Amino acid sequence: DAVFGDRVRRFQEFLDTFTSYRDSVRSIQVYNSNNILPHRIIISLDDLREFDRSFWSGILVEPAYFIPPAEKALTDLADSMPWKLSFKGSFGAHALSPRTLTAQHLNKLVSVEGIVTKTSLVRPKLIRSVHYAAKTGRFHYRDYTDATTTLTTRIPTPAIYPTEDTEGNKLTTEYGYSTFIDHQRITVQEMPEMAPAGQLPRSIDVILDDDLVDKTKPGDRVNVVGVFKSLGAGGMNQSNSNTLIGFKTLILGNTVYPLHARSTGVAARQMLTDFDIRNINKLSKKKDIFDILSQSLAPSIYGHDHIKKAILLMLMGGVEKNLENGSHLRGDINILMVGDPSTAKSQLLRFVLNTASLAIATTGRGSSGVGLTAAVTTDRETGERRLEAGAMVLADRGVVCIDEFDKMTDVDRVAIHEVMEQQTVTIAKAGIHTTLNARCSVIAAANPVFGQYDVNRDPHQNIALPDSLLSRFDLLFVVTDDINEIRDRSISEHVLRTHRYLPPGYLEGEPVRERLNLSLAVLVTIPFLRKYVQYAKERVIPQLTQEAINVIVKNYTDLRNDDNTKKSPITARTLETLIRLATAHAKVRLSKTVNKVDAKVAANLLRFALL
Amino acid sequence: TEIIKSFKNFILEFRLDSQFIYRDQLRNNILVKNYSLTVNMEHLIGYNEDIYKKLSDEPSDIIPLFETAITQVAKRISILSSLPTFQLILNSNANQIPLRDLDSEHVSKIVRLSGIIISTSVLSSRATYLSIMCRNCRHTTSITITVSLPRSCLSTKNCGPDPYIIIHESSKFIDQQFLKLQEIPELVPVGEMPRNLTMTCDRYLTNKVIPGTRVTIVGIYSIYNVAIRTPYIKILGIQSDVETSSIWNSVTMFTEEEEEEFLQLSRNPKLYEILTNSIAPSIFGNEDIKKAIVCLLMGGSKKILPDGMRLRGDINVLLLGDPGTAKSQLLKFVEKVSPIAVYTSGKGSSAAGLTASVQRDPMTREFYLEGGAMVLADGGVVCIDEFDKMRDEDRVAIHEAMEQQTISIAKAGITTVLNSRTSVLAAANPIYGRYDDLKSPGDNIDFQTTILSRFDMIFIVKDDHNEERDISIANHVINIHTGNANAMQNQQEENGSEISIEKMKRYITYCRLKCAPRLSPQAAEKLSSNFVTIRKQLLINELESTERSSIPITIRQLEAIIRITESLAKLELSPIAQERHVDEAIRLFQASTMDAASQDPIGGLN
Amino acid sequence: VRKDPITKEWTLEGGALVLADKGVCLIDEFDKMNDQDRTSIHEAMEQQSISISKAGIVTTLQARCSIIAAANPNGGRYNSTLPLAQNVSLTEPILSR
DNA sequence: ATGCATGCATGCATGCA
DNA sequence: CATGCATGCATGCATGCAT
Ligand SMILES: Nc1ncnc2c1ncn2[C@@H]1O[C@H](COP(=O)(O)OP(=O)(O)O)[C@@H](O)[C@H]1O
Ligand SMILES: Nc1ncnc2c1ncn2[C@@H]1O[C@H](COP(=O)(O)OP(=O)(O)O)[C@@H](O)[C@H]1O
Ligand SMILES: [Mg+2]
Ligand SMILES: [Mg+2]
Ligand SMILES: [Zn+2]
């Protein structure tokens, strides 16, 4: 009875010392004085460790006797100037996974990372029930509670819905004046990247409510911070129930974070500071910007300067349109490479898979054409025939990297025609008729039909793809391994230079260590490239101008009536391609007008790709 | 009472092997936070037989006494040098009883069984200290551990029946697990379904075996519920008999004596020859194949660049040749002398795949890796026999696994990039039954010649018919059967001229774990000058002729040699690779690949 | 890895090659097998062992048994004009053991 | 004229209620 | 666990083109 108040005081003086969280109280409060933000604050456990070790160890080891006091202190501060708490920072040995969670950790605050495997349907929960009595003309109210509402244990109460007033007057429900709170239950499993091969994985349930009720979707990588609890009685109460059962366990979540990985739905994100923005703006002034940002892509590969420029343009992307009637004009860029063996194709696909904010990788004969377009007519537990998302659906607003693209059969290639140009997946099969969004872009690699590019034969004899498919690819590049003497000396020296490199903080001969990269979502280094791309894509939308209009219309007309031979046919789509590329370049310069240089660069790039 | 006294005396003073072992074992365990003690039951046929016969009979009543005795002696150990009850693991090496002979005479007695595990459930929570409260008057109390909660209020104003509630915030629990044992599926009856058994373990004996392990159990044959009950086994100890290696159970701890032994071996001025002579000494010749199989087991040196690109550090080897040249026996040997290794064929193994498979869980209906040879062997070696016959999806997957060291899965619902860092040793046979001299090497295979550029070294072993080497081989194979070439002729050679299979297996693990060589500036020049030379003599002969060479020379072979050279320095624990190693790298590369292009009409011109 | 008809229990059951260890396997109609049977027999006759990776069970089993097989030639009549390797469907890797 | 490759049509495996 | 319908994957056969 007295420890509670002492703990309340100790958290009040903890808030008093560190004034950051005080600031973040006026913040979600002055703004609710005209989306109401939710009253949840986040505290760093490192600060709480450096302030008071005993209180820190209590939260980590004995949450049920330390958290409610902190919540009461926080509510008191807010009212003086309820509010709930979330925790971030180091967790020591408490940071576990579904495989390593044992009975030793029950009734402790833990953080668990894994893959979200099964979500539920959000439902409301009754928390206060109001009633009206017309005979007396008065309002009454009842309250309810359950085990999973508070951390401490409270004697069960006899939940009963009132129907008659003490005087006998009949009551009627006032559904609009009652209180309801949302509730979801999810399942977390051990990630495939960490689970041992050939062994069945382990799972754990998590319960979320209120403002944490819908923040992740199945198949995502998640990190949940909450209390590991026990409920019920494993036959103990019963005189004779069984001797082979135990108590039921679950996690009362209070924080959920989505983690970004490779070939996963969640998209990476960084927090941009004033320093980052200033540096980006300063860097964008230099005239060689398109070359600085372009030679820094895969700097361990020699040459391919134009494929690298195309990669950067695809990363930046153009601007799409939506007319009033309801028309849609594509705004993405797609790339195809056809090449000889050992021309650094799969090593550029993997670079894109590793540097793009969201990308999914797929091979050729590997994934069928229903696994890409989401034809997952399946059934759920409720019984509703549902479509399960696919590679191109999950990659909405992302990229798809296709390796061995020539091995994909026609029955599988024809499913991608709609996605590459209409940017939708309309599935109509027994009992189901729906349309999903697939606004993705594609980068694909392939090799000739003869093993190597035969220069004597016509391009159609080598590439061997339909013109329908070839039109949808914006840029098609041909790469050849021609044996030289001057070039071989340079490419050997470069390769041998790469193979002699020591990471900082290592001793020559010491093996290097590898780790998995699970970041927390929300020449120049790679991080700066990501920051630059994010800023440019999120805060720039250029507009066409007459000069670009003239350059594009001249180039298109000249290309259509030509006596040359092209690796791909020329249609109306090419015009749009010229408009896209131009816009992308204007996006790289952080300009709001597609100037003439943009159009000229687009023309040069397309002409190199074709001729 | 006397039981607890005798047990305490036993633990405190046994002194077998002129040393007290349980005392020091407790001293170590109480520090490493392992509240348990392991004791052999035959030791108790010594010090006192009365307690041994009192334990083997009516064990359910005696075990608790021993455990509390251990707790009270650990008290003394801690004080002289709050914790929970100490668990007793009970190993044994006595006669076993077949799983099919358990009957009434064995009920409630300690028994020894042997079998194979086939399933292991998830862990369960059992209570060891309950805190309870009366819902009417708020009387609080506790329980210590079938026990049940007080039927009536103990405060003695009528609280009623079952007035207590469990206060979980202050209670204590422990783990539990279930296991299924099945009789070895090789002495079953001749067409009757095999028997099986259930078993329950707790506390410190959970998460110690995985399905498919052959094991021995010591436990209690107990019974649980017209007058028919269900038998089962209460585990007291488990001992693994047959297991399988993998990445997760690998041992990274080296004893000081082992370190000194390996450091002494590293300085042998003839190590590179002893290692070669230890590779399959029962086959005749094939010196260069063995020298390559040695560089294969060490690997190169993987690098990571500040741009996120990953450089490979493994060797892939291909063997083409006629039937009966002992190229299948070599793969079987490579399988036995590597820490992690899988041996398979092109079309997979019986009821086991070749690459990653993603099937749904038997119970949960969720996605899980079933298991594939290219992911089971991560960090090891995969030996693929009959490389020429296999499915197309397998080809496309192995191509990625062989350079990017990973397999990517994009199925409905699940998308993941796995890890497959292995080395491929492949054996194939030419079409038509013999390797024709008139036809180019590319026309003697049954798959795209674009695949031959993947491997780092290709050997073409041909069986030439000669009346001398025939008698030589006949005498050699007669000797191994006669027994004079058995373990009489290779034991003489272990005296500094040969290594054993387990010594060398550990010497490979130590080298992989400790050393990662790096070329020197002189070796870079000597490697960059040979490459610009091998590729002029291919352009010349291709320009002269009309067709292209079946065996191509690509940038993947410059790195293949940088890997052969970095691998020849890693067996000596050397931190820098010198031109002395580049010379041997070039020599090995000329005997395998350029000797394969030497037989092509176009590439082998001049 | 199948289910027991009566006990509702999983059972790891090796084929006739793992059940015939230290014995003999008598195979009839040896020329009319599917892919699975050919792969299993190939592994047994090569390494005298059988691997398995199914439903959480990753193990190997001994198959040290001799094999006696019966078959019929292509087309139902032996053609003495051709080598034996062309009168039977079995490939060379299995016919060399 | 023969052989190989590609596309199509027939079969099976799954999944279901 | 048998019956019968709809999806999706795999295989074998036929036809056309090239050498
Ligand atoms: N231009 C290049 N610069 C540097 N390394 C290269 C270059 N071209 C090829 N390589 C190397 O050769 C190897 C070829 O592998 P990969 O990229 O898969 O070939 P492919 O072009 O068939 O995809 C890579 O490991 C890469 O490091
Ligand atoms: N060079 C050799 N030295 C010793 N024994 C050999 C040699 N070549 C073949 N043998 C014998 O032949 C068998 C190997 O045949 P196998 O490897 O199955 O043929 P293949 O290599 O065509 O698959 C072994 O039993 C081995 O004793
Ligand atoms: Mg490739
Ligand atoms: Mg063989
Ligand atoms: Zn009471």
PDB file of C-alpha atoms in Angstrom, chain A residues 180-315:
ATOM      1  CA  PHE A 180     -16.063  -0.386 -26.685  1.00  0.00           C
ATOM      2  CA  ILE A 181     -12.352  -1.048 -27.248  1.00  0.00           C
ATOM      3  CA  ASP A 182     -10.756  -2.907 -30.153  1.00  0.00           C
ATOM      4  CA  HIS A 183      -9.060  -6.277 -29.678  1.00  0.00           C
ATOM      5  CA  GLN A 184      -6.846  -8.430 -31.941  1.00  0.00           C
ATOM      6  CA  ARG A 185      -4.871 -11.682 -31.355  1.00  0.00           C
ATOM      7  CA  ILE A 186      -1.843 -12.615 -33.508  1.00  0.00           C
ATOM      8  CA  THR A 187       0.666 -15.469 -33.790  1.00  0.00           C
ATOM      9  CA  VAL A 188       4.452 -15.065 -34.099  1.00  0.00           C
ATOM     10  CA  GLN A 189       6.904 -17.723 -35.279  1.00  0.00           C
ATOM     11  CA  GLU A 190      10.653 -18.144 -35.659  1.00  0.00           C
ATOM     12  CA  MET A 191      11.947 -16.540 -38.850  1.00  0.00           C
ATOM     13  CA  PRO A 192      13.056 -18.872 -41.668  1.00  0.00           C
ATOM     14  CA  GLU A 193      16.377 -16.993 -41.726  1.00  0.00           C
ATOM     15  CA  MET A 194      17.122 -18.223 -38.183  1.00  0.00           C
ATOM     16  CA  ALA A 195      15.197 -21.447 -37.582  1.00  0.00           C
ATOM     17  CA  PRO A 196      17.254 -24.651 -37.902  1.00  0.00           C
ATOM     18  CA  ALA A 197      16.662 -26.478 -41.162  1.00  0.00           C
ATOM     19  CA  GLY A 198      14.521 -29.598 -41.125  1.00  0.00           C
ATOM     20  CA  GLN A 199      12.931 -28.995 -37.705  1.00  0.00           C
ATOM     21  CA  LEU A 200       9.391 -27.838 -37.024  1.00  0.00           C
ATOM     22  CA  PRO A 201       9.319 -24.228 -35.748  1.00  0.00           C
ATOM     23  CA  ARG A 202       7.916 -22.844 -32.492  1.00  0.00           C
ATOM     24  CA  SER A 203       5.106 -20.296 -32.071  1.00  0.00           C
ATOM     25  CA  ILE A 204       3.799 -17.820 -29.492  1.00  0.00           C
ATOM     26  CA  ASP A 205       0.519 -15.904 -29.261  1.00  0.00           C
ATOM     27  CA  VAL A 206       0.355 -12.146 -28.663  1.00  0.00           C
ATOM     28  CA  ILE A 207      -2.676 -10.068 -27.653  1.00  0.00           C
ATOM     29  CA  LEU A 208      -3.101  -6.431 -28.682  1.00  0.00           C
ATOM     30  CA  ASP A 209      -5.820  -3.926 -27.862  1.00  0.00           C
ATOM     31  CA  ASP A 210      -6.756  -0.271 -28.234  1.00  0.00           C
ATOM     32  CA  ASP A 211      -4.243   1.594 -30.458  1.00  0.00           C
ATOM     33  CA  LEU A 212      -1.975  -1.315 -31.171  1.00  0.00           C
ATOM     34  CA  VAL A 213      -4.740  -3.385 -32.715  1.00  0.00           C
ATOM     35  CA  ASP A 214      -3.843  -3.209 -36.425  1.00  0.00           C
ATOM     36  CA  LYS A 215      -0.243  -2.414 -37.332  1.00  0.00           C
ATOM     37  CA  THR A 216       1.080  -5.566 -39.039  1.00  0.00           C
ATOM     38  CA  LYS A 217      -0.080  -8.074 -41.637  1.00  0.00           C
ATOM     39  CA  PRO A 218       0.624 -11.793 -42.051  1.00  0.00           C
ATOM     40  CA  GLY A 219       4.031 -12.779 -43.361  1.00  0.00           C
ATOM     41  CA  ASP A 220       5.862  -9.755 -41.938  1.00  0.00           C
ATOM     42  CA  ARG A 221       8.882  -9.531 -39.659  1.00  0.00           C
ATOM     43  CA  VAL A 222       7.924  -8.133 -36.265  1.00  0.00           C
ATOM     44  CA  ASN A 223       9.380  -7.340 -32.848  1.00  0.00           C
ATOM     45  CA  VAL A 224       6.955  -7.274 -29.903  1.00  0.00           C
ATOM     46  CA  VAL A 225       7.762  -5.960 -26.420  1.00  0.00           C
ATOM     47  CA  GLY A 226       5.377  -7.164 -23.734  1.00  0.00           C
ATOM     48  CA  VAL A 227       4.895  -9.158 -20.551  1.00  0.00           C
ATOM     49  CA  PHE A 228       5.003 -12.960 -20.605  1.00  0.00           C
ATOM     50  CA  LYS A 229       2.027 -14.143 -18.525  1.00  0.00           C
ATOM     51  CA  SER A 230       0.173 -17.243 -17.343  1.00  0.00           C
ATOM     52  CA  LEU A 231      -3.581 -17.739 -17.067  1.00  0.00           C
ATOM     53  CA  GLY A 232      -6.207 -20.178 -15.862  1.00  0.00           C
ATOM     54  CA  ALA A 233      -5.591 -23.348 -13.890  1.00  0.00           C
ATOM     55  CA  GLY A 234      -4.053 -26.383 -15.563  1.00  0.00           C
ATOM     56  CA  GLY A 235      -6.481 -28.737 -13.864  1.00  0.00           C
ATOM     57  CA  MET A 236      -5.332 -27.636 -10.408  1.00  0.00           C
ATOM     58  CA  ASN A 237      -8.774 -26.410  -9.339  1.00  0.00           C
ATOM     59  CA  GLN A 238     -10.554 -29.523 -10.612  1.00  0.00           C
ATOM     60  CA  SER A 239     -10.608 -32.564  -8.348  1.00  0.00           C
ATOM     61  CA  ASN A 240      -9.597 -34.844 -11.237  1.00  0.00           C
ATOM     62  CA  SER A 241      -8.954 -33.301 -14.663  1.00  0.00           C
ATOM     63  CA  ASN A 242      -5.698 -34.729 -16.065  1.00  0.00           C
ATOM     64  CA  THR A 243      -1.994 -35.208 -15.347  1.00  0.00           C
ATOM     65  CA  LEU A 244      -0.671 -34.247 -18.798  1.00  0.00           C
ATOM     66  CA  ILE A 245      -1.648 -30.561 -19.162  1.00  0.00           C
ATOM     67  CA  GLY A 246      -0.137 -27.271 -18.061  1.00  0.00           C
ATOM     68  CA  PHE A 247      -0.986 -23.607 -17.758  1.00  0.00           C
ATOM     69  CA  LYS A 248      -1.795 -21.531 -20.883  1.00  0.00           C
ATOM     70  CA  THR A 249       0.661 -18.712 -21.765  1.00  0.00           C
ATOM     71  CA  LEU A 250       0.616 -15.618 -23.968  1.00  0.00           C
ATOM     72  CA  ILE A 251       2.159 -12.151 -24.259  1.00  0.00           C
ATOM     73  CA  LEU A 252       0.315  -8.948 -23.331  1.00  0.00           C
ATOM     74  CA  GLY A 253       1.842  -6.765 -25.993  1.00  0.00           C
ATOM     75  CA  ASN A 254       2.548  -3.115 -25.335  1.00  0.00           C
ATOM     76  CA  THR A 255       4.906  -2.317 -28.225  1.00  0.00           C
ATOM     77  CA  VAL A 256       5.056  -3.620 -31.805  1.00  0.00           C
ATOM     78  CA  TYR A 257       7.722  -2.752 -34.395  1.00  0.00           C
ATOM     79  CA  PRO A 258       7.863  -3.858 -38.059  1.00  0.00           C
ATOM     80  CA  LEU A 259      11.335  -4.960 -39.202  1.00  0.00           C
ATOM     81  CA  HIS A 260      12.681  -4.565 -42.735  1.00  0.00           C
ATOM     82  CA  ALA A 261      14.390  -7.533 -44.389  1.00  0.00           C
ATOM     83  CA  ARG A 262      15.202  -8.759 -47.905  1.00  0.00           C
ATOM     84  CA  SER A 263      12.416 -10.136 -50.102  1.00  0.00           C
ATOM     85  CA  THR A 264       9.852  -9.095 -47.478  1.00  0.00           C
ATOM     86  CA  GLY A 265       6.751  -6.934 -47.556  1.00  0.00           C
ATOM     87  CA  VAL A 266       7.816  -4.202 -45.143  1.00  0.00           C
ATOM     88  CA  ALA A 267       9.625  -1.233 -46.686  1.00  0.00           C
ATOM     89  CA  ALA A 268      12.754   0.323 -45.213  1.00  0.00           C
ATOM     90  CA  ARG A 269      12.702   3.890 -43.932  1.00  0.00           C
ATOM     91  CA  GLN A 270      15.130   6.322 -42.317  1.00  0.00           C
ATOM     92  CA  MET A 271      14.627   9.435 -40.210  1.00  0.00           C
ATOM     93  CA  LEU A 272      16.021  12.487 -41.996  1.00  0.00           C
ATOM     94  CA  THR A 273      17.594  15.184 -39.840  1.00  0.00           C
ATOM     95  CA  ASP A 274      18.442  18.792 -40.634  1.00  0.00           C
ATOM     96  CA  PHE A 275      22.044  17.802 -41.366  1.00  0.00           C
ATOM     97  CA  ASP A 276      20.989  15.178 -43.911  1.00  0.00           C
ATOM     98  CA  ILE A 277      18.647  17.569 -45.718  1.00  0.00           C
ATOM     99  CA  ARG A 278      21.271  20.312 -45.842  1.00  0.00           C
ATOM    100  CA  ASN A 279      23.865  17.904 -47.224  1.00  0.00           C
ATOM    101  CA  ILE A 280      21.458  16.589 -49.873  1.00  0.00           C
ATOM    102  CA  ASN A 281      20.617  20.117 -51.006  1.00  0.00           C
ATOM    103  CA  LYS A 282      24.303  21.061 -51.130  1.00  0.00           C
ATOM    104  CA  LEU A 283      25.208  17.934 -53.107  1.00  0.00           C
ATOM    105  CA  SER A 284      22.437  18.455 -55.666  1.00  0.00           C
ATOM    106  CA  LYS A 285      24.061  21.682 -56.913  1.00  0.00           C
ATOM    107  CA  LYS A 286      27.068  20.027 -58.576  1.00  0.00           C
ATOM    108  CA  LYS A 287      26.714  19.578 -62.331  1.00  0.00           C
ATOM    109  CA  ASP A 288      28.155  16.042 -62.422  1.00  0.00           C
ATOM    110  CA  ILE A 289      25.488  14.821 -59.993  1.00  0.00           C
ATOM    111  CA  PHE A 290      24.077  12.245 -62.410  1.00  0.00           C
ATOM    112  CA  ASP A 291      27.579  10.748 -62.667  1.00  0.00           C
ATOM    113  CA  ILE A 292      28.417  10.865 -58.950  1.00  0.00           C
ATOM    114  CA  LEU A 293      25.161   9.120 -58.056  1.00  0.00           C
ATOM    115  CA  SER A 294      25.710   6.671 -60.930  1.00  0.00           C
ATOM    116  CA  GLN A 295      29.307   5.510 -60.565  1.00  0.00           C
ATOM    117  CA  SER A 296      28.553   4.786 -56.894  1.00  0.00           C
ATOM    118  CA  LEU A 297      26.142   1.970 -57.794  1.00  0.00           C
ATOM    119  CA  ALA A 298      27.962  -1.357 -57.446  1.00  0.00           C
ATOM    120  CA  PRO A 299      31.464   0.189 -57.534  1.00  0.00           C
ATOM    121  CA  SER A 300      33.012  -3.297 -57.435  1.00  0.00           C
ATOM    122  CA  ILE A 301      31.826  -3.972 -61.010  1.00  0.00           C
ATOM    123  CA  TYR A 302      33.858  -2.574 -63.901  1.00  0.00           C
ATOM    124  CA  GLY A 303      32.114  -0.465 -66.531  1.00  0.00           C
ATOM    125  CA  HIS A 304      28.438  -0.848 -67.487  1.00  0.00           C
ATOM    126  CA  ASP A 305      28.053   2.901 -67.037  1.00  0.00           C
ATOM    127  CA  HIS A 306      24.763   3.020 -68.924  1.00  0.00           C
ATOM    128  CA  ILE A 307      23.061   0.119 -67.181  1.00  0.00           C
ATOM    129  CA  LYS A 308      23.991   1.887 -63.932  1.00  0.00           C
ATOM    130  CA  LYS A 309      22.406   5.121 -65.143  1.00  0.00           C
ATOM    131  CA  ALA A 310      19.289   3.144 -66.069  1.00  0.00           C
ATOM    132  CA  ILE A 311      19.247   1.519 -62.626  1.00  0.00           C
ATOM    133  CA  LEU A 312      19.341   4.916 -60.935  1.00  0.00           C
ATOM    134  CA  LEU A 313      16.558   6.210 -63.192  1.00  0.00           C
ATOM    135  CA  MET A 314      14.405   3.179 -62.371  1.00  0.00           C
ATOM    136  CA  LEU A 315      15.047   3.712 -58.665  1.00  0.00           C
TER     137      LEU A 315
END
